[PDB]
PDB file of N, CA and C in Angstrom:
ATOM      1  N   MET A 547     -19.826  44.326  68.768  1.00  0.00           N
ATOM      2  CA  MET A 547     -18.524  43.899  68.252  1.00  0.00           C
ATOM      3  C   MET A 547     -18.583  43.650  66.752  1.00  0.00           C
ATOM      4  N   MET A 548     -17.529  44.052  66.055  1.00  0.00           N
ATOM      5  CA  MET A 548     -17.449  43.924  64.608  1.00  0.00           C
ATOM      6  C   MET A 548     -16.671  42.666  64.250  1.00  0.00           C
ATOM      7  N   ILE A 549     -17.282  41.797  63.455  1.00  0.00           N
ATOM      8  CA  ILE A 549     -16.657  40.561  62.989  1.00  0.00           C
ATOM      9  C   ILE A 549     -16.481  40.696  61.484  1.00  0.00           C
ATOM     10  N   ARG A 550     -15.237  40.862  61.045  1.00  0.00           N
ATOM     11  CA  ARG A 550     -14.922  41.067  59.640  1.00  0.00           C
ATOM     12  C   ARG A 550     -14.086  39.912  59.090  1.00  0.00           C
ATOM     13  N   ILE A 551     -14.270  39.636  57.801  1.00  0.00           N
ATOM     14  CA  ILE A 551     -13.576  38.520  57.165  1.00  0.00           C
ATOM     15  C   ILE A 551     -13.180  38.878  55.735  1.00  0.00           C
ATOM     16  N   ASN A 552     -11.923  39.250  55.539  1.00  0.00           N
ATOM     17  CA  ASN A 552     -11.377  39.459  54.201  1.00  0.00           C
ATOM     18  C   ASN A 552     -10.942  38.152  53.545  1.00  0.00           C
ATOM     19  N   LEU A 553     -11.822  37.154  53.506  1.00  0.00           N
ATOM     20  CA  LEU A 553     -11.483  35.879  52.864  1.00  0.00           C
ATOM     21  C   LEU A 553     -12.308  35.618  51.599  1.00  0.00           C
ATOM     22  N   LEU A 554     -11.589  35.378  50.502  1.00  0.00           N
ATOM     23  CA  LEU A 554     -12.023  35.426  49.110  1.00  0.00           C
ATOM     24  C   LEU A 554     -12.700  36.773  48.696  1.00  0.00           C
ATOM     25  N   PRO A 555     -11.968  37.859  48.926  1.00  0.00           N
ATOM     26  CA  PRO A 555     -11.640  38.807  47.857  1.00  0.00           C
ATOM     27  C   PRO A 555     -10.134  38.966  47.714  1.00  0.00           C
ATOM     28  N   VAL A 556      -9.727  39.965  46.954  1.00  0.00           N
ATOM     29  CA  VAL A 556      -9.756  39.880  45.495  1.00  0.00           C
ATOM     30  C   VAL A 556      -8.521  39.460  44.667  1.00  0.00           C
ATOM     31  N   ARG A 557      -7.282  39.863  44.942  1.00  0.00           N
ATOM     32  CA  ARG A 557      -6.215  39.296  44.116  1.00  0.00           C
ATOM     33  C   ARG A 557      -6.155  37.798  44.372  1.00  0.00           C
ATOM     34  N   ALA A 558      -6.610  37.360  45.557  1.00  0.00           N
ATOM     35  CA  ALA A 558      -6.880  35.942  45.774  1.00  0.00           C
ATOM     36  C   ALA A 558      -8.016  35.454  44.880  1.00  0.00           C
ATOM     37  N   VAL A 559      -9.117  36.206  44.825  1.00  0.00           N
ATOM     38  CA  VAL A 559     -10.269  35.830  44.011  1.00  0.00           C
ATOM     39  C   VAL A 559      -9.815  35.713  42.570  1.00  0.00           C
ATOM     40  N   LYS A 560      -9.504  36.855  41.952  1.00  0.00           N
ATOM     41  CA  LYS A 560      -9.239  36.903  40.522  1.00  0.00           C
ATOM     42  C   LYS A 560      -7.959  36.173  40.148  1.00  0.00           C
ATOM     43  N   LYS A 561      -7.097  35.830  41.115  1.00  0.00           N
ATOM     44  CA  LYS A 561      -5.960  34.987  40.757  1.00  0.00           C
ATOM     45  C   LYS A 561      -6.321  33.508  40.824  1.00  0.00           C
ATOM     46  N   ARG A 562      -7.285  33.143  41.676  1.00  0.00           N
ATOM     47  CA  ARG A 562      -7.861  31.806  41.580  1.00  0.00           C
ATOM     48  C   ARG A 562      -8.679  31.668  40.302  1.00  0.00           C
ATOM     49  N   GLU A 563      -9.322  32.757  39.874  1.00  0.00           N
ATOM     50  CA  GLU A 563     -10.105  32.747  38.643  1.00  0.00           C
ATOM     51  C   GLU A 563      -9.205  32.658  37.415  1.00  0.00           C
ATOM     52  N   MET A 564      -8.203  33.533  37.309  1.00  0.00           N
ATOM     53  CA  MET A 564      -7.224  33.386  36.232  1.00  0.00           C
ATOM     54  C   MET A 564      -6.595  31.998  36.271  1.00  0.00           C
ATOM     55  N   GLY A 565      -6.282  31.508  37.475  1.00  0.00           N
ATOM     56  CA  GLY A 565      -5.788  30.149  37.610  1.00  0.00           C
ATOM     57  C   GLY A 565      -6.726  29.110  37.027  1.00  0.00           C
ATOM     58  N   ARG A 566      -8.038  29.309  37.178  1.00  0.00           N
ATOM     59  CA  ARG A 566      -9.004  28.376  36.593  1.00  0.00           C
ATOM     60  C   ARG A 566      -9.026  28.492  35.070  1.00  0.00           C
ATOM     61  N   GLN A 567      -9.104  29.723  34.554  1.00  0.00           N
ATOM     62  CA  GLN A 567      -9.245  29.930  33.112  1.00  0.00           C
ATOM     63  C   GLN A 567      -8.039  29.397  32.343  1.00  0.00           C
ATOM     64  N   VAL A 568      -6.826  29.681  32.825  1.00  0.00           N
ATOM     65  CA  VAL A 568      -5.633  29.179  32.155  1.00  0.00           C
ATOM     66  C   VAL A 568      -5.672  27.660  32.039  1.00  0.00           C
ATOM     67  N   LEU A 569      -6.135  26.979  33.092  1.00  0.00           N
ATOM     68  CA  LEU A 569      -6.223  25.526  33.072  1.00  0.00           C
ATOM     69  C   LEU A 569      -7.321  25.025  32.141  1.00  0.00           C
ATOM     70  N   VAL A 570      -8.460  25.722  32.079  1.00  0.00           N
ATOM     71  CA  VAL A 570      -9.492  25.349  31.120  1.00  0.00           C
ATOM     72  C   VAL A 570      -8.958  25.453  29.695  1.00  0.00           C
ATOM     73  N   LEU A 571      -8.235  26.530  29.395  1.00  0.00           N
ATOM     74  CA  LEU A 571      -7.624  26.670  28.078  1.00  0.00           C
ATOM     75  C   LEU A 571      -6.655  25.527  27.790  1.00  0.00           C
ATOM     76  N   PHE A 572      -5.812  25.185  28.767  1.00  0.00           N
ATOM     77  CA  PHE A 572      -4.961  24.009  28.631  1.00  0.00           C
ATOM     78  C   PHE A 572      -5.773  22.776  28.256  1.00  0.00           C
ATOM     79  N   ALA A 573      -6.861  22.528  28.988  1.00  0.00           N
ATOM     80  CA  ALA A 573      -7.684  21.343  28.742  1.00  0.00           C
ATOM     81  C   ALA A 573      -8.240  21.337  27.324  1.00  0.00           C
ATOM     82  N   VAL A 574      -8.747  22.483  26.863  1.00  0.00           N
ATOM     83  CA  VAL A 574      -9.317  22.552  25.519  1.00  0.00           C
ATOM     84  C   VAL A 574      -8.252  22.254  24.468  1.00  0.00           C
ATOM     85  N   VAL A 575      -7.103  22.926  24.561  1.00  0.00           N
ATOM     86  CA  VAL A 575      -6.036  22.696  23.595  1.00  0.00           C
ATOM     87  C   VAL A 575      -5.640  21.225  23.573  1.00  0.00           C
ATOM     88  N   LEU A 576      -5.532  20.605  24.749  1.00  0.00           N
ATOM     89  CA  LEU A 576      -5.077  19.221  24.804  1.00  0.00           C
ATOM     90  C   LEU A 576      -6.143  18.253  24.284  1.00  0.00           C
ATOM     91  N   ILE A 577      -7.428  18.589  24.434  1.00  0.00           N
ATOM     92  CA  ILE A 577      -8.471  17.751  23.852  1.00  0.00           C
ATOM     93  C   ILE A 577      -8.440  17.844  22.331  1.00  0.00           C
ATOM     94  N   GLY A 578      -8.296  19.057  21.796  1.00  0.00           N
ATOM     95  CA  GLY A 578      -8.172  19.202  20.351  1.00  0.00           C
ATOM     96  C   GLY A 578      -6.988  18.446  19.782  1.00  0.00           C
ATOM     97  N   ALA A 579      -5.788  18.682  20.339  1.00  0.00           N
ATOM     98  CA  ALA A 579      -4.611  17.938  19.903  1.00  0.00           C
ATOM     99  C   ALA A 579      -4.840  16.436  20.013  1.00  0.00           C
ATOM    100  N   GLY A 580      -5.534  15.999  21.075  1.00  0.00           N
ATOM    101  CA  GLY A 580      -5.918  14.601  21.165  1.00  0.00           C
ATOM    102  C   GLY A 580      -6.687  14.137  19.947  1.00  0.00           C
ATOM    103  N   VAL A 581      -7.807  14.815  19.644  1.00  0.00           N
ATOM    104  CA  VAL A 581      -8.623  14.466  18.480  1.00  0.00           C
ATOM    105  C   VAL A 581      -7.772  14.386  17.214  1.00  0.00           C
ATOM    106  N   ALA A 582      -6.834  15.316  17.039  1.00  0.00           N
ATOM    107  CA  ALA A 582      -5.934  15.235  15.892  1.00  0.00           C
ATOM    108  C   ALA A 582      -5.136  13.932  15.898  1.00  0.00           C
ATOM    109  N   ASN A 583      -4.422  13.658  17.000  1.00  0.00           N
ATOM    110  CA  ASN A 583      -3.683  12.404  17.123  1.00  0.00           C
ATOM    111  C   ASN A 583      -4.545  11.212  16.743  1.00  0.00           C
ATOM    112  N   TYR A 584      -5.783  11.195  17.232  1.00  0.00           N
ATOM    113  CA  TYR A 584      -6.752  10.191  16.801  1.00  0.00           C
ATOM    114  C   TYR A 584      -6.860  10.180  15.283  1.00  0.00           C
ATOM    115  N   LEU A 585      -7.703  11.051  14.706  1.00  0.00           N
ATOM    116  CA  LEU A 585      -7.988  11.014  13.264  1.00  0.00           C
ATOM    117  C   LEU A 585      -6.779  10.550  12.446  1.00  0.00           C
ATOM    118  N   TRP A 586      -5.586  11.050  12.792  1.00  0.00           N
ATOM    119  CA  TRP A 586      -4.355  10.491  12.250  1.00  0.00           C
ATOM    120  C   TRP A 586      -4.313   8.965  12.414  1.00  0.00           C
ATOM    121  N   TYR A 587      -4.519   8.461  13.645  1.00  0.00           N
ATOM    122  CA  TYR A 587      -4.432   7.007  13.861  1.00  0.00           C
ATOM    123  C   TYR A 587      -5.355   6.230  12.922  1.00  0.00           C
ATOM    124  N   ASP A 588      -6.502   6.814  12.564  1.00  0.00           N
ATOM    125  CA  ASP A 588      -7.463   6.107  11.727  1.00  0.00           C
ATOM    126  C   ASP A 588      -7.010   6.080  10.278  1.00  0.00           C
ATOM    127  N   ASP A 589      -6.562   7.229   9.753  1.00  0.00           N
ATOM    128  CA  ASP A 589      -6.002   7.207   8.405  1.00  0.00           C
ATOM    129  C   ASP A 589      -4.834   6.234   8.311  1.00  0.00           C
ATOM    130  N   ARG A 590      -4.078   6.078   9.401  1.00  0.00           N
ATOM    131  CA  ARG A 590      -2.946   5.157   9.392  1.00  0.00           C
ATOM    132  C   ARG A 590      -3.394   3.701   9.389  1.00  0.00           C
ATOM    133  N   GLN A 591      -4.451   3.373  10.129  1.00  0.00           N
ATOM    134  CA  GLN A 591      -4.950   2.002  10.095  1.00  0.00           C
ATOM    135  C   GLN A 591      -5.545   1.662   8.730  1.00  0.00           C
ATOM    136  N   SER A 592      -6.244   2.618   8.109  1.00  0.00           N
ATOM    137  CA  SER A 592      -6.711   2.412   6.741  1.00  0.00           C
ATOM    138  C   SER A 592      -5.553   2.128   5.790  1.00  0.00           C
ATOM    139  N   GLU A 593      -4.506   2.956   5.843  1.00  0.00           N
ATOM    140  CA  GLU A 593      -3.341   2.712   4.997  1.00  0.00           C
ATOM    141  C   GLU A 593      -2.754   1.326   5.258  1.00  0.00           C
ATOM    142  N   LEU A 594      -2.663   0.931   6.535  1.00  0.00           N
ATOM    143  CA  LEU A 594      -2.151  -0.397   6.873  1.00  0.00           C
ATOM    144  C   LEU A 594      -2.989  -1.505   6.242  1.00  0.00           C
ATOM    145  N   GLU A 595      -4.308  -1.363   6.237  1.00  0.00           N
ATOM    146  CA  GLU A 595      -5.142  -2.399   5.631  1.00  0.00           C
ATOM    147  C   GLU A 595      -4.944  -2.453   4.120  1.00  0.00           C
ATOM    148  N   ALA A 596      -4.876  -1.289   3.461  1.00  0.00           N
ATOM    149  CA  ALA A 596      -4.594  -1.289   2.031  1.00  0.00           C
ATOM    150  C   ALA A 596      -3.263  -1.972   1.733  1.00  0.00           C
ATOM    151  N   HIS A 597      -2.239  -1.680   2.539  1.00  0.00           N
ATOM    152  CA  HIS A 597      -0.908  -2.229   2.287  1.00  0.00           C
ATOM    153  C   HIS A 597      -0.871  -3.732   2.536  1.00  0.00           C
ATOM    154  N   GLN A 598      -1.584  -4.207   3.564  1.00  0.00           N
ATOM    155  CA  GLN A 598      -1.666  -5.649   3.784  1.00  0.00           C
ATOM    156  C   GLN A 598      -2.432  -6.347   2.661  1.00  0.00           C
ATOM    157  N   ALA A 599      -3.449  -5.687   2.097  1.00  0.00           N
ATOM    158  CA  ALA A 599      -4.066  -6.206   0.879  1.00  0.00           C
ATOM    159  C   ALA A 599      -3.034  -6.345  -0.237  1.00  0.00           C
ATOM    160  N   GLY A 600      -2.210  -5.313  -0.442  1.00  0.00           N
ATOM    161  CA  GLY A 600      -1.156  -5.413  -1.441  1.00  0.00           C
ATOM    162  C   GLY A 600      -0.182  -6.551  -1.179  1.00  0.00           C
ATOM    163  N   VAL A 601       0.217  -6.736   0.085  1.00  0.00           N
ATOM    164  CA  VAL A 601       1.141  -7.820   0.425  1.00  0.00           C
ATOM    165  C   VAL A 601       0.509  -9.169   0.104  1.00  0.00           C
ATOM    166  N   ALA A 602      -0.783  -9.325   0.402  1.00  0.00           N
ATOM    167  CA  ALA A 602      -1.488 -10.532  -0.026  1.00  0.00           C
ATOM    168  C   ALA A 602      -1.419 -10.692  -1.541  1.00  0.00           C
ATOM    169  N   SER A 603      -1.608  -9.597  -2.284  1.00  0.00           N
ATOM    170  CA  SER A 603      -1.437  -9.640  -3.729  1.00  0.00           C
ATOM    171  C   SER A 603      -0.027 -10.056  -4.141  1.00  0.00           C
TER     172      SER A 603
ATOM    173  N   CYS B  32     -13.790   3.583   0.069  1.00  0.00           N
ATOM    174  CA  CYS B  32     -13.444   3.369  -1.336  1.00  0.00           C
ATOM    175  C   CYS B  32     -12.027   3.924  -1.623  1.00  0.00           C
ATOM    176  N   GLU B  33     -11.532   3.755  -2.852  1.00  0.00           N
ATOM    177  CA  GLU B  33     -10.415   4.553  -3.388  1.00  0.00           C
ATOM    178  C   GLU B  33     -10.925   5.579  -4.421  1.00  0.00           C
ATOM    179  N   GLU B  34     -10.415   6.801  -4.312  1.00  0.00           N
ATOM    180  CA  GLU B  34     -10.811   8.012  -5.050  1.00  0.00           C
ATOM    181  C   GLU B  34     -10.049   8.146  -6.422  1.00  0.00           C
ATOM    182  N   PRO B  35     -10.156   9.249  -7.212  1.00  0.00           N
ATOM    183  CA  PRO B  35      -9.726   9.350  -8.622  1.00  0.00           C
ATOM    184  C   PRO B  35      -8.406   8.689  -9.070  1.00  0.00           C
ATOM    185  N   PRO B  36      -7.258   9.250  -8.652  1.00  0.00           N
ATOM    186  CA  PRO B  36      -6.362   8.438  -7.838  1.00  0.00           C
ATOM    187  C   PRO B  36      -6.763   8.439  -6.363  1.00  0.00           C
ATOM    188  N   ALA B  37      -6.222   7.467  -5.627  1.00  0.00           N
ATOM    189  CA  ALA B  37      -6.382   7.292  -4.188  1.00  0.00           C
ATOM    190  C   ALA B  37      -5.867   8.538  -3.403  1.00  0.00           C
ATOM    191  N   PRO B  38      -5.616   8.474  -2.084  1.00  0.00           N
ATOM    192  CA  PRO B  38      -4.867   9.532  -1.370  1.00  0.00           C
ATOM    193  C   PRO B  38      -3.410   9.718  -1.922  1.00  0.00           C
ATOM    194  N   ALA B  39      -2.357   9.985  -1.123  1.00  0.00           N
ATOM    195  CA  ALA B  39      -1.023  10.283  -1.724  1.00  0.00           C
ATOM    196  C   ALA B  39       0.213   9.345  -1.561  1.00  0.00           C
ATOM    197  N   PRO B  40       0.384   8.395  -0.602  1.00  0.00           N
ATOM    198  CA  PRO B  40       1.655   7.623  -0.489  1.00  0.00           C
ATOM    199  C   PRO B  40       1.925   6.321  -1.314  1.00  0.00           C
ATOM    200  N   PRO B  41       1.025   5.734  -2.139  1.00  0.00           N
ATOM    201  CA  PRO B  41       0.159   6.402  -3.092  1.00  0.00           C
ATOM    202  C   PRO B  41      -1.365   6.412  -2.774  1.00  0.00           C
ATOM    203  N   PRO B  42      -1.938   5.915  -1.646  1.00  0.00           N
ATOM    204  CA  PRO B  42      -1.567   4.854  -0.708  1.00  0.00           C
ATOM    205  C   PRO B  42      -1.538   3.442  -1.260  1.00  0.00           C
ATOM    206  N   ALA B  43      -0.800   2.615  -0.508  1.00  0.00           N
ATOM    207  CA  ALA B  43      -0.827   1.151  -0.452  1.00  0.00           C
ATOM    208  C   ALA B  43      -0.694   0.370  -1.779  1.00  0.00           C
ATOM    209  N   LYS B  44      -1.033   0.918  -2.961  1.00  0.00           N
ATOM    210  CA  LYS B  44      -1.000   0.200  -4.250  1.00  0.00           C
ATOM    211  C   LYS B  44       0.386  -0.065  -4.879  1.00  0.00           C
ATOM    212  N   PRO B  45       1.455   0.570  -4.410  1.00  0.00           N
ATOM    213  CA  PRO B  45       2.638  -0.156  -3.942  1.00  0.00           C
ATOM    214  C   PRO B  45       2.440  -1.667  -4.015  1.00  0.00           C
ATOM    215  N   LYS B  46       1.509  -2.185  -3.222  1.00  0.00           N
ATOM    216  CA  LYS B  46       1.523  -3.593  -2.843  1.00  0.00           C
ATOM    217  C   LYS B  46       0.407  -4.364  -3.541  1.00  0.00           C
ATOM    218  N   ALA B  47      -0.744  -3.719  -3.695  1.00  0.00           N
ATOM    219  CA  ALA B  47      -1.806  -4.240  -4.548  1.00  0.00           C
ATOM    220  C   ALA B  47      -1.368  -4.286  -6.008  1.00  0.00           C
ATOM    221  N   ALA B  48      -0.943  -3.140  -6.530  1.00  0.00           N
ATOM    222  CA  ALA B  48      -0.615  -3.019  -7.945  1.00  0.00           C
ATOM    223  C   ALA B  48       0.864  -3.295  -8.194  1.00  0.00           C
ATOM    224  N   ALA B  49       1.427  -4.216  -7.419  1.00  0.00           N
ATOM    225  CA  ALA B  49       2.685  -4.858  -7.783  1.00  0.00           C
ATOM    226  C   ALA B  49       2.607  -6.370  -7.594  1.00  0.00           C
ATOM    227  N   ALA B  50       1.932  -6.795  -6.532  1.00  0.00           N
ATOM    228  CA  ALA B  50       1.577  -8.199  -6.362  1.00  0.00           C
ATOM    229  C   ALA B  50       0.398  -8.582  -7.249  1.00  0.00           C
ATOM    230  N   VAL B  51      -0.225  -7.579  -7.861  1.00  0.00           N
ATOM    231  CA  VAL B  51      -0.890  -7.761  -9.159  1.00  0.00           C
ATOM    232  C   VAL B  51       0.155  -7.590 -10.294  1.00  0.00           C
ATOM    233  N   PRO B  52       0.101  -6.569 -11.190  1.00  0.00           N
ATOM    234  CA  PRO B  52       0.716  -6.613 -12.530  1.00  0.00           C
ATOM    235  C   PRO B  52       1.170  -7.986 -13.062  1.00  0.00           C
ATOM    236  N   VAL B  53       0.261  -8.947 -13.253  1.00  0.00           N
ATOM    237  CA  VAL B  53      -1.215  -8.806 -13.335  1.00  0.00           C
ATOM    238  C   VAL B  53      -1.886  -9.721 -12.297  1.00  0.00           C
ATOM    239  N   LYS B  54      -2.876 -10.535 -12.680  1.00  0.00           N
ATOM    240  CA  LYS B  54      -3.074 -11.851 -12.047  1.00  0.00           C
ATOM    241  C   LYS B  54      -1.788 -12.712 -12.130  1.00  0.00           C
ATOM    242  N   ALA B  55      -0.870 -12.282 -13.016  1.00  0.00           N
ATOM    243  CA  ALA B  55       0.156 -13.014 -13.742  1.00  0.00           C
ATOM    244  C   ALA B  55      -0.397 -14.106 -14.680  1.00  0.00           C
ATOM    245  N   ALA B  56      -1.364 -14.892 -14.186  1.00  0.00           N
ATOM    246  CA  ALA B  56      -1.583 -16.278 -14.546  1.00  0.00           C
ATOM    247  C   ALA B  56      -0.513 -17.197 -13.902  1.00  0.00           C
ATOM    248  N   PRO B  57       0.741 -17.180 -14.340  1.00  0.00           N
ATOM    249  CA  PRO B  57       1.072 -16.794 -15.715  1.00  0.00           C
ATOM    250  C   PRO B  57       0.980 -17.977 -16.674  1.00  0.00           C
ATOM    251  N   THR B  58       0.455 -17.735 -17.870  1.00  0.00           N
ATOM    252  CA  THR B  58       0.397 -18.763 -18.904  1.00  0.00           C
ATOM    253  C   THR B  58       1.796 -19.215 -19.310  1.00  0.00           C
ATOM    254  N   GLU B  59       2.449 -19.964 -18.428  1.00  0.00           N
ATOM    255  CA  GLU B  59       3.136 -21.189 -18.821  1.00  0.00           C
ATOM    256  C   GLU B  59       2.316 -21.978 -19.836  1.00  0.00           C
ATOM    257  N   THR B  60       2.074 -21.372 -20.994  1.00  0.00           N
ATOM    258  CA  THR B  60       1.201 -21.963 -22.001  1.00  0.00           C
ATOM    259  C   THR B  60       1.863 -21.966 -23.373  1.00  0.00           C
ATOM    260  N   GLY B  61       1.349 -21.136 -24.276  1.00  0.00           N
ATOM    261  CA  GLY B  61       0.947 -21.595 -25.591  1.00  0.00           C
ATOM    262  C   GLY B  61       2.045 -21.430 -26.623  1.00  0.00           C
ATOM    263  N   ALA B  62       3.054 -22.291 -26.548  1.00  0.00           N
ATOM    264  CA  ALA B  62       4.260 -22.131 -27.353  1.00  0.00           C
ATOM    265  C   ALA B  62       4.010 -22.524 -28.805  1.00  0.00           C
ATOM    266  N   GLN B  63       4.961 -22.196 -29.673  1.00  0.00           N
ATOM    267  CA  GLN B  63       5.093 -22.874 -30.958  1.00  0.00           C
ATOM    268  C   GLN B  63       6.549 -23.217 -31.253  1.00  0.00           C
ATOM    269  N   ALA B  64       6.784 -23.841 -32.402  1.00  0.00           N
ATOM    270  CA  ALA B  64       7.936 -24.717 -32.578  1.00  0.00           C
ATOM    271  C   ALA B  64       8.607 -24.482 -33.926  1.00  0.00           C
ATOM    272  N   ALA B  65       9.928 -24.634 -33.959  1.00  0.00           N
ATOM    273  CA  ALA B  65      10.679 -24.586 -35.220  1.00  0.00           C
ATOM    274  C   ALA B  65      10.651 -25.911 -36.029  1.00  0.00           C
ATOM    275  N   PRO B  66       9.876 -26.904 -35.551  1.00  0.00           N
ATOM    276  CA  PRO B  66      10.371 -28.268 -35.274  1.00  0.00           C
ATOM    277  C   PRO B  66      11.883 -28.469 -35.498  1.00  0.00           C
ATOM    278  N   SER B  67      12.294 -29.602 -36.066  1.00  0.00           N
ATOM    279  CA  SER B  67      13.642 -29.856 -36.591  1.00  0.00           C
ATOM    280  C   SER B  67      13.520 -30.692 -37.873  1.00  0.00           C
ATOM    281  N   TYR B  68      14.590 -30.771 -38.657  1.00  0.00           N
ATOM    282  CA  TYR B  68      14.579 -31.357 -40.003  1.00  0.00           C
ATOM    283  C   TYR B  68      15.681 -32.416 -40.123  1.00  0.00           C
ATOM    284  N   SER B  69      15.392 -33.498 -40.848  1.00  0.00           N
ATOM    285  CA  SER B  69      16.341 -34.572 -41.156  1.00  0.00           C
ATOM    286  C   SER B  69      17.145 -34.291 -42.435  1.00  0.00           C
ATOM    287  N   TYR B  70      18.184 -35.098 -42.678  1.00  0.00           N
ATOM    288  CA  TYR B  70      19.125 -34.932 -43.797  1.00  0.00           C
ATOM    289  C   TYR B  70      19.120 -36.095 -44.802  1.00  0.00           C
ATOM    290  N   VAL B  71      19.555 -35.829 -46.039  1.00  0.00           N
ATOM    291  CA  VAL B  71      19.421 -36.719 -47.211  1.00  0.00           C
ATOM    292  C   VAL B  71      20.695 -36.689 -48.066  1.00  0.00           C
ATOM    293  N   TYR B  72      21.102 -37.733 -48.790  1.00  0.00           N
ATOM    294  CA  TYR B  72      20.863 -39.181 -48.688  1.00  0.00           C
ATOM    295  C   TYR B  72      22.109 -39.854 -49.314  1.00  0.00           C
ATOM    296  N   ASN B  73      22.460 -41.083 -48.916  1.00  0.00           N
ATOM    297  CA  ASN B  73      23.697 -41.732 -49.370  1.00  0.00           C
ATOM    298  C   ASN B  73      23.525 -42.540 -50.674  1.00  0.00           C
ATOM    299  N   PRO B  74      23.974 -41.988 -51.815  1.00  0.00           N
ATOM    300  CA  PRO B  74      24.630 -42.828 -52.817  1.00  0.00           C
ATOM    301  C   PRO B  74      25.738 -42.124 -53.630  1.00  0.00           C
ATOM    302  N   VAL B  75      26.602 -42.987 -54.177  1.00  0.00           N
ATOM    303  CA  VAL B  75      26.698 -43.118 -55.642  1.00  0.00           C
ATOM    304  C   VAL B  75      26.207 -44.500 -56.052  1.00  0.00           C
ATOM    305  N   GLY B  76      25.500 -44.575 -57.184  1.00  0.00           N
ATOM    306  CA  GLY B  76      25.004 -45.832 -57.744  1.00  0.00           C
ATOM    307  C   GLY B  76      26.128 -46.762 -58.212  1.00  0.00           C
ATOM    308  N   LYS B  77      25.773 -48.012 -58.529  1.00  0.00           N
ATOM    309  CA  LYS B  77      26.672 -49.015 -59.124  1.00  0.00           C
ATOM    310  C   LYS B  77      26.017 -49.671 -60.341  1.00  0.00           C
ATOM    311  N   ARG B  78      26.838 -50.210 -61.249  1.00  0.00           N
ATOM    312  CA  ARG B  78      26.382 -50.854 -62.487  1.00  0.00           C
ATOM    313  C   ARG B  78      26.831 -52.309 -62.532  1.00  0.00           C
ATOM    314  N   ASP B  79      25.907 -53.086 -63.052  1.00  0.00           N
ATOM    315  CA  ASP B  79      25.958 -54.458 -63.527  1.00  0.00           C
ATOM    316  C   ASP B  79      25.196 -54.374 -64.895  1.00  0.00           C
ATOM    317  N   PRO B  80      23.935 -54.833 -64.885  1.00  0.00           N
ATOM    318  CA  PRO B  80      22.749 -54.009 -65.019  1.00  0.00           C
ATOM    319  C   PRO B  80      22.861 -52.590 -64.396  1.00  0.00           C
ATOM    320  N   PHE B  81      22.505 -51.508 -65.087  1.00  0.00           N
ATOM    321  CA  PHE B  81      21.610 -51.479 -66.238  1.00  0.00           C
ATOM    322  C   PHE B  81      22.355 -51.222 -67.558  1.00  0.00           C
ATOM    323  N   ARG B  82      23.701 -51.278 -67.613  1.00  0.00           N
ATOM    324  CA  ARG B  82      24.397 -50.951 -68.865  1.00  0.00           C
ATOM    325  C   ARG B  82      24.096 -51.946 -69.985  1.00  0.00           C
ATOM    326  N   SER B  83      24.331 -53.242 -69.787  1.00  0.00           N
ATOM    327  CA  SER B  83      23.908 -54.250 -70.780  1.00  0.00           C
ATOM    328  C   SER B  83      22.411 -54.226 -71.169  1.00  0.00           C
ATOM    329  N   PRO B  84      21.454 -54.229 -70.228  1.00  0.00           N
ATOM    330  CA  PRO B  84      20.029 -54.249 -70.584  1.00  0.00           C
ATOM    331  C   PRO B  84      19.451 -52.953 -71.201  1.00  0.00           C
ATOM    332  N   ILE B  85      20.236 -51.883 -71.454  1.00  0.00           N
ATOM    333  CA  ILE B  85      19.799 -50.754 -72.312  1.00  0.00           C
ATOM    334  C   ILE B  85      20.923 -50.207 -73.221  1.00  0.00           C
TER     335      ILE B  85
END
């Protein structure tokens, strides 16, 4: 008797794979944009400290 | 630190370099004076003396 299993090939395979890659790209872009939002936050806190020094003046 | 000029908004010296200009002090100090001057003087003279004695 022949026991066959067409489970995980291929438009299922490569569409789960494309599904993975698109999401990895999403993750990378969102981590980068995150880092940007950060570095911005730091320049802003520095500016705030300079300005509070001025207000003390 | 702050650079040649600083960054650009300008930053912050808005507030440092206005709540400075300067220390102020400020010398509530070292005046001088016009003073003031008095006025002079009441007569016409009278005779008894000295007409007879010269």
